[PDB]
Amino acid sequence: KGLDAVRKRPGMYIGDTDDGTGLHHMVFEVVDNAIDEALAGHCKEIIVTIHADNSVSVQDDGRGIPTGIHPEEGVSAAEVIMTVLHAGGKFDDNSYKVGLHGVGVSVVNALSQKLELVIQREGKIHRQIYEHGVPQAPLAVTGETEKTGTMVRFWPSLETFTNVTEFEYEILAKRLRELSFLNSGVSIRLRDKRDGKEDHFHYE
Ligand SMILES: Cc1[nH]c(C(=O)Nc2nc3c(OCc4cccc(C(=O)O)c4)cc(C(=O)O)cc3s2)c(Cl)c1Cl
Ligand SMILES: [Mg+2]
């Protein structure tokens, strides 16, 4: 019900879907959840990549989204946060009234024709794929790791986002400079695989 409401009324969640506002807000919601993981004391570096196909990935080195089975939903906690709008505690399905805290990545998932989630946690890499917010398989172990963190790569839905479908480096760079200044403990990298441009923001 939650993701359906987002697909139907994306304007209410992410902003204008025609003038590039919503499209960049998609990146901002993912980055905000990485910044929350830095605020909480776990994440020290965030890497934002504009891929050659105008998907965007956000990598953090925090705890990794929990992978254990959710006691209520009976699927991975990661799948619950990705697919149950109310679970993150930021958004709900109200079509009348539009806040500050909680995980909002389910809105990005809903409005992405594809999303890739990779979690490094408890010595294992875990991967799940979604299309239009629908998981294509359960969260699966792909390998071993000595690191922790979360990677979200999303392909904005070309059924939702019209006219402006390509990311503007400068729009993302400005928000990451602001976030780097305010979150002086975090290193933020921006990489554009379309033209090779890269930046590193870290409070000096
Ligand atoms: C790029 C990116 N990174 C992350 C991310 O690392 N997030 C994480 N959230 C948690 C977590 O809380 C999940 C939750 C659920 C409901 C409301 C909240 C809240 O903050 O209000 C929070 C718990 C634990 C634990 O117990 O080890 C670890 C993690 S890592 C996300 Cl998401 C996106 Cl996107
Ligand atoms: Mg409701």
Swiss-Prot record:
Changing K90 to E/I/T: Retains ATP-independent DNA relaxation and quinolone-induced DNA cleavage; loss of supercoiling activity, loss of ATPase, does not bind ATP analogs. Residues 1-204 are annotated as: ATPase domain. Na(+) binds at K90, D92. Changing E29D: 7% supercoiling activity, 16% DNA-dependent ATPase activity, fluoroquinolone-induced DNA cleavage normal, 40% ATP-independent DNA relaxation, binds ATP normally, complements the N4177 ts mutant. Changing E29Q: No supercoiling or DNA-dependent ATPase activity, binds ATP normally, does not complement the N4177 ts mutant. It comes from the Bacteria. ATP binds at D60, G89, K90, Y96, L100, H101, G102, V103, G104, V105. K(+) binds at I81, V84, A87, G102, S106. The active site is at E29 (proton acceptor (atpase activity)). Changing E29A: No supercoiling or DNA-dependent ATPase activity, 25% fluoroquinolone-induced DNA cleavage, 50% ATP-independent DNA relaxation, binds ATP normally, does not complement the N4177 ts mutant. Changing K97 to E/V: Binds about 50% ATP analog, 2- to 3-fold decreased ATPase, retains ATP-independent DNA relaxation, quinolone-induced DNA cleavage and negative supercoiling activity. ADP binds at N33. It is found in: Cytoplasm. Disulfide bonds: none annotated. Consists of 3 domains; the ATPase domain (residues 1-220), the transducer domain (221-392) and the toprim domain (393-804). ATP-binding is cooperative, and both subunits must be wild-type at residue 103 for supercoiling to occur. Non-hydrolyzable ATP analogs (and ATP-binding) induce dimerization and enhance ATPase activity. ATP hydrolysis induces domain shifts that are probably part of the mechanism of DNA cleavage and rejoining. When the enzyme transiently cleaves DNA a phosphotyrosine bond is formed between GyrA and DNA in an ATP-independent manner. In the presence of quinolones this intermediate can be trapped and is used as an indicator of drug toxicity. DNA gyrase negatively supercoils closed circular double-stranded DNA in an ATP-dependent manner to maintain chromosomes in an underwound state. This makes better substrates for topoisomerase 4 (ParC and ParE) which is the main enzyme that unlinks newly replicated chromosomes in E.coli. Gyrase catalyzes the interconversion of other topological isomers of double-stranded DNA rings, including catenanes. Relaxes negatively supercoiled DNA in an ATP-independent manner. Heterotetramer, composed of two GyrA and two GyrB chains. In the heterotetramer, GyrA contains the active site tyrosine that forms a transient covalent intermediate with the DNA, while GyrB binds cofactors and catalyzes ATP hydrolysis. Belongs to the type II topoisomerase family. This is DNA gyrase subunit B.
